[PDB]
Design an enzyme around this catalytic site. Structure first.
Site, PDB file in Angstrom:
ATOM      1  CE1 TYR A  51      -4.357   0.877  -0.427  1.00 17.58           C
ATOM      2  CE2 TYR A  51      -4.487  -1.327   0.540  1.00 17.58           C
ATOM      3  CZ  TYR A  51      -5.072  -0.286  -0.159  1.00 17.58           C
ATOM      4  OH  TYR A  51      -6.367  -0.421  -0.587  1.00 17.58           O
ATOM      5  CD  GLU A  53      -4.565   4.674   0.896  1.00 18.65           C
ATOM      6  OE1 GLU A  53      -4.074   4.524   2.033  1.00 18.65           O
ATOM      7  OE2 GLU A  53      -5.796   4.705   0.688  1.00 18.65           O
ATOM      8  CG  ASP A 197      -7.022  10.838 -24.423  1.00 24.02           C
ATOM      9  OD1 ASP A 197      -6.005  10.108 -24.338  1.00 24.02           O
ATOM     10  OD2 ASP A 197      -8.168  10.433 -24.155  1.00 24.02           O
ATOM     11  CB  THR A 223      -3.175   4.200 -22.672  1.00 26.57           C
ATOM     12  OG1 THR A 223      -2.842   4.467 -24.042  1.00 26.57           O
ATOM     13  CG2 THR A 223      -4.682   4.319 -22.505  1.00 26.57           C
ATOM     14  CE  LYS A 226      -5.619   2.618 -26.035  1.00 27.85           C
ATOM     15  NZ  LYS A 226      -6.679   3.657 -26.198  1.00 27.85           N
ATOM     16  NE  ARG A 232      -4.659  -3.997 -21.325  1.00 25.33           N
ATOM     17  CZ  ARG A 232      -5.059  -3.662 -22.552  1.00 25.33           C
ATOM     18  NH1 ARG A 232      -6.015  -2.756 -22.721  1.00 25.33           N
ATOM     19  NH2 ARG A 232      -4.513  -4.240 -23.613  1.00 25.33           N
TER      20      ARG A 232
HETATM   21  C1  PLP Z   1      -9.021  -0.358   1.035  1.00 21.81           C
HETATM   22  C2  PLP Z   1     -10.462   0.098   0.976  1.00 21.81           C
HETATM   23  C3  PLP Z   1     -10.989   0.793  -0.136  1.00 21.81           C
HETATM   24  C4  PLP Z   1     -10.189   1.209  -1.342  1.00 21.81           C
HETATM   25  O1  PLP Z   1      -9.466   0.292  -2.172  1.00 21.81           O
HETATM   26  P1  PLP Z   1      -8.311   0.821  -3.170  1.00 21.81           P
HETATM   27  O2  PLP Z   1      -7.970  -0.422  -3.889  1.00 21.81           O
HETATM   28  O3  PLP Z   1      -7.248   1.340  -2.263  1.00 21.81           O
HETATM   29  O4  PLP Z   1      -8.933   1.889  -3.993  1.00 21.81           O
HETATM   30  C5  PLP Z   1     -12.326   1.176  -0.145  1.00 21.81           C
HETATM   31  N1  PLP Z   1     -13.154   0.877   0.918  1.00 21.81           N
HETATM   32  C6  PLP Z   1     -12.665   0.202   2.016  1.00 21.81           C
HETATM   33  C7  PLP Z   1     -13.591  -0.099   3.164  1.00 21.81           C
HETATM   34  C8  PLP Z   1     -11.323  -0.181   2.054  1.00 21.81           C
HETATM   35  O5  PLP Z   1     -10.912  -0.788   3.042  1.00 21.81           O
HETATM   36  C1  PLP Z   2      -7.526   3.754 -25.154  1.00 18.38           C
HETATM   37  C2  PLP Z   2      -7.915   5.194 -24.902  1.00 18.38           C
HETATM   38  C3  PLP Z   2      -8.473   5.622 -23.676  1.00 18.38           C
HETATM   39  C4  PLP Z   2      -8.797   4.712 -22.520  1.00 18.38           C
HETATM   40  O1  PLP Z   2      -7.830   3.879 -21.868  1.00 18.38           O
HETATM   41  P1  PLP Z   2      -8.300   2.642 -20.943  1.00 18.38           P
HETATM   42  O2  PLP Z   2      -7.005   2.192 -20.397  1.00 18.38           O
HETATM   43  O3  PLP Z   2      -8.950   1.696 -21.893  1.00 18.38           O
HETATM   44  O4  PLP Z   2      -9.254   3.205 -19.954  1.00 18.38           O
HETATM   45  C5  PLP Z   2      -8.799   6.961 -23.491  1.00 18.38           C
HETATM   46  N1  PLP Z   2      -8.577   7.887 -24.490  1.00 18.38           N
HETATM   47  C6  PLP Z   2      -8.037   7.496 -25.698  1.00 18.38           C
HETATM   48  C7  PLP Z   2      -7.817   8.528 -26.770  1.00 18.38           C
HETATM   49  C8  PLP Z   2      -7.713   6.155 -25.911  1.00 18.38           C
HETATM   50  O5  PLP Z   2      -7.226   5.832 -26.993  1.00 18.38           O
END
Ligand code: PLP
Ligand code: PLP
Lengths: 405, 405
Positions: A51, A53, A197, A223, A226, A232
């Protein structure tokens, strides 16, 4: 793999099918690529256990000394690649990168001007079924009906009429260079922020083969997968003046814990993109797309905008009296992977379409060159001119197999 | 690893530091765990290469036959584990799982009732710096000032006064069993949906050691990491009547392409959780937490709620005249990882706090038992009673090293 085959035969068997599929097929989906073994190893690391954050040196939790090094490597290499004043490498996806930028500069119901979705704009640029179109008031600019190039006077007119707080430039299906200087000029005229973008073209930008939006845009989203050929995920680049707000938008704004293992993989991918051989790769991507475009035209196909400046092209199938759906289906039968795609001013729904979108990033990564582009074009011609001939499709199948070995 | 060490010495060196750190330290951060090698291998697979927008058998792109099998394995195993009518395994994180549920049932500005953030509620349950608190009108219920148990009459009164569209139950720092039946009763009285965010307790729910929210909640959100011991990501469970809307909320609503490699890892983790030995693990987690709680009290520490029903506990440091920040810092010096955490009715800011939060999931995964809990408690006593003695801290350091080998 060592442990997965024993622990989970079902998951392993499916993964192995997918691995073999990736080798056997000709992948022409423009958003697709194949990452390095180093990138995958980074994703498969123990960094998933941490973790983290917050940000490097400013985390919620202790023990982040080493994941901090990893995140900073990602940020600094991204800044090297794109010449940006600030990088945020935490976005889980391209969608989340965009989401964060919108969260930073916009209030609910604010007007945003983006590219017409049927002309090349992305889902996250105002689709009424996407958070973007639901949360904000999206208006659209279009391409010229003849040239299929962005009509910059239309961008300007829409901007002046609707007075957007934000203008979005960039696309998921636009085969030509985007003029970021003109977008910024228009943005400046109406007092709007400019977001670019660059998800599809990020690798080409990194290699100096498409103009860099960074000097012109307040925000650049992308991204990491691509054309950039990374894991990813997403990334935001921005001017130093927005760094604090952008970081706060990602966390605690829209995300929780970052994916530190994916961020490691991002660092690896950026390291690869910084190398000379990536520049050579990206040039082959663009060269291959031009060659494929030319070869498709030689086969009698019409292309949206009459060709390409980048990694992708769109075939307008109307002269052949075919829908994109039909073409997509029959090409699937012979082992060529494309997607149906709306063309500008398409008479068909996005579920049927008059086009197929094709990109060269994936086949180039596999080592395909100009001769292979010629053959791919010839196979597509054979298939689409003979959709009712099983003999033709079998010949295509055999020629596809010859290409993939 | 084979390729990463050669390709990227910098990234590899940092990853190796992190791997060694994970072994050397005593990880007591309640949200942390250590995943199996099989889970990591799944994440490090070629599935990162596949775009799979949409759902199994209903994808945007062709070629998803095998990733479809993987996603269905994840969904079906999740349904087996939790007895849910529907699972969505695409959320990138716990944050995104919550985001999607909010997007499904709420409009901008709708009232939501969640647990007081200073009493155990999560950031995504209405923090004014989080999208939840910005997008929706969050109101809070509290724990009793003496027992630190949720005051169900306060839940009811807040619900009846504020008339929320949605009630959220569940927590990131609540050491006792949550009564989901009572939450649903209150929800029914005011005509509100009930969402349970079980992220922290999901593993315990899976093992039958905490009551299951699924029968009582319209929506259940969770992380796949934490006590469930899966890869970093999110998941939504819901009644069949919400399946279509929930799926649409994730895509095309709030996300784009899913992380298919992470989804593979999710399937692996769910497979592991279905096994008898995971049930034994989860019982040791709870047993260890009770033992650690008891042992800490033996050392003279006061615990929020007077103990624990689950994997986690909170030390109220006011009797020792220490802040959570001070405790966190000095424990870091000896190799024990905790986080400062607000206690209910904390006189300090969330940046200082009067408490530390401790969980046993990670140390249990490493094979720690009751005897180790006793020693951990004794070390914490030694450290916090002698914050100004370098000799005491060095003894602690040596005892910590003895535990981790
Ligand atoms: C850890 C947690 C989240 C958030 O998860 P992430 O993967 O950090 O976004 C949301 N709600 C509760 C209750 C959590 O414990
Ligand atoms: C692929 C793409 C996204 C989204 O990415 P994800 O990882 O699929 O959410 C957003 N904007 C453009 C222009 C893209 O080509």
């Amino acid at each position: 793999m060592k442990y997965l085959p024993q622990q989970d035969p079902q998951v392993f068997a499916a993964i192995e099918q997918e691995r073999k599929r990736q080798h056997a097929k000709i992948e022409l989906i423009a958003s697709e690529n194949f990452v390095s073994r180093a990138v995958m190893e980074a994703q498969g690391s123990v960094l998933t256990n941490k973790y983290a954050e917050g940000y490097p040196g400013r985390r919620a939790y202790g023990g982040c000394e080493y994941v901090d090094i990893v995140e900073e490597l990602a940020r600094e290499r991204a800044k090297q690649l794109f010449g940006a004043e600030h990088a945020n490498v935490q976005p889980h996806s391209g969608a989340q990168a965009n989401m964060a930028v919108y969260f930073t500069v916009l209030e609910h119901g604010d007007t945003v001007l983006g590219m017409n979705l049927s002309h090349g704009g992305h889902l996250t640029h105002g689709s009424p079924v996407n958070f973007s179109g639901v949360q904000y008031n999206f208006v659209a600019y279009g391409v010229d009906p003849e040239t299929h190039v962005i009509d910059y006077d239309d961008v300007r007119e829409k901007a002046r009429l609707h007075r957007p707080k934000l203008i979005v430039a960039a696309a998921s299906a636009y085969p030509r260079i985007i003029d970021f200087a003109k977008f910024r000029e228009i943005a400046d005229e109406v007092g709007a922020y400019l977001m670019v973008d660059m998800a599809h073209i990020a690798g080409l930008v990194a290699a100096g083969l498409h103009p860099n939006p960074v000097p012109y845009a307040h925000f650049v989203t992308t991204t990491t997968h691509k054309t950039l050929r990374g894991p990813r995920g997403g990334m935001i680049l921005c001017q130093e003046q927005f760094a604090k707000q952008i970081d706060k938008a990602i966390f605690p704004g829209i995300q929780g814990g970052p994916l530190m293992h994916v961020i490691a993989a991002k660092a690896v991918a950026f390291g690869e993109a910084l190398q000379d051989d990536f520049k050579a790769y990206a040039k082959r991507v663009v060269d291959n797309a031009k060659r494929l475009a030319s070869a498709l035209q030689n086969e009698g196909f019409t292309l949206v905008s009459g060709g390409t400046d980048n990694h992708l092209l769109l075939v307008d199938l109307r002269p052949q009296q075919l829908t994109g759906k039909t073409a997509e289906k029959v090409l699937d039968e012979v082992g060529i992977t494309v997607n149906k795609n709306t063309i500008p001013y398409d008479p068909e729904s996005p579920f049927v379409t008059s086009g197929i979108r094709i990109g060269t990033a994936a086949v180039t990564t596999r080592g395909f060159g100009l001769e292979e582009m010629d053959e791919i074009a010839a196979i597509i011609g054979l298939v689409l001119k003979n959709v009712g001939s099983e003999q033709a499709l079998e010949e295509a199948r055999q020629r596809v197999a010859a290409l993939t070995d």
